Design a protein around this ligand. Sequence first.
Ligand SMILES: CC(C)CN(C[C@@H](O)[C@H](Cc1cccc(F)c1)NC(=O)O[C@H]1[C@H]2CO[C@H]3OC[C@@H]1[C@H]3C2)S(=O)(=O)c1ccc2nc(NC3CC3)sc2c1
Lengths: 99, 99
Amino acid sequence: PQITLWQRPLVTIKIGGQLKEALLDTGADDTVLEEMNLPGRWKPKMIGGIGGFIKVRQYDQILIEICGHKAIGTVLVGPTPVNIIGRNLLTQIGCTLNF
Amino acid sequence: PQITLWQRPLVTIKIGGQLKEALLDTGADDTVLEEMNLPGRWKPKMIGGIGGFIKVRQYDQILIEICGHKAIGTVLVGPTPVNIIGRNLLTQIGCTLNF
Ligand SMILES: CC(C)CN(C[C@@H](O)[C@H](Cc1cccc(F)c1)NC(=O)O[C@H]1[C@H]2CO[C@H]3OC[C@@H]1[C@H]3C2)S(=O)(=O)c1ccc2nc(NC3CC3)sc2c1
């Protein structure tokens, strides 16, 4: 699709057997999801944003279906206020900005 | 232009007589710039992001030239780690996401 930006660019994702909504976020290097139940091992990481940092669990080689496209990569799970799809996965689905 | 997302989507902006770089950020509702010298009145505001909140100065009807396109709107100025162009201004320059 083409998505204009008059509203937040939310999409449906499927990850870990679960359906969620997430924001297509060109300002995010990485993908950060709300606390959720994922299988597998993970590693602790801290990440920064506008208001300081948060501790996240880093999961690698996770499958995520984003508005009907499949992608595999790193997903960070922790206390983010919004589910964010970052450039690590936006590149895999072929997303571009245009103006 | 069309911008792919293998690198951060940075652009040059001109605001308040000054040249800066900023990130085209579809995950940002509003535009948030580093502390900088802007003329005019402003109002205090707090905004939230991944790691808590920050206090910003809200300036309205500010002219900003973003990669060669002009836009007028609200700019929030405060301790953000990165200069962010949000959807309030991305819509004015006609920016879309595509995949
Ligand atoms: C600050 C930008 C630079 C980065 N952020 C991505 C922005 O798009 C976030 C998304 C957002 C939206 C809503 C709530 C949020 F909690 C967060 N928007 C944002 O703060 O906007 C603020 C501000 C704008 O107006 C309004 O609109 C939303 C909200 C409110 C006030 S990030 O989430 O912090 C991030 C994400 C991934 C990531 N990966 C990293 N990896 C390591 C470096 C390698 S670091 C890193 C940091």
